[PDB]
Amino acid sequence: MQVSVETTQGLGRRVTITIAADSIETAVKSELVNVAKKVRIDGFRKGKVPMNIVAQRYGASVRQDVLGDLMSRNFIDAIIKEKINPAGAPTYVPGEYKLGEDFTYSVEFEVYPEV
What we know:
Blueprint: E1 2-7, E2 13-18, H1 22-37, H2 57-81, E3 91-94, E4 105-108
Helix pairs in contact: 1-2
PDB class: isomerase
Keywords: isomerase, translation, CO-translational protein folding
Assembly: monomeric
């Protein structure tokens, strides 16, 4: 992962992150498809509907939901790689997402006091 950790501002910290493209595209392909597929779902016949001839309206929803999905994943993986401490609710601060390209976003939080 590609991680930057800024530090200090009265216990405050900010972690700025750069997410790969191929890693999150597994979540789009695999994850999505998978969790959709079996669990219940509706009137899907064989597979689960390829993008096909309903149009790419559902595409706007692939590409757009993928713009949301794409966001989410690495930021969790990233904060792990420059390692840091938790304490109460995290604040997710999104950047601009560009399709098929790398994604940046941030976490502000507090830490439990230590000595």
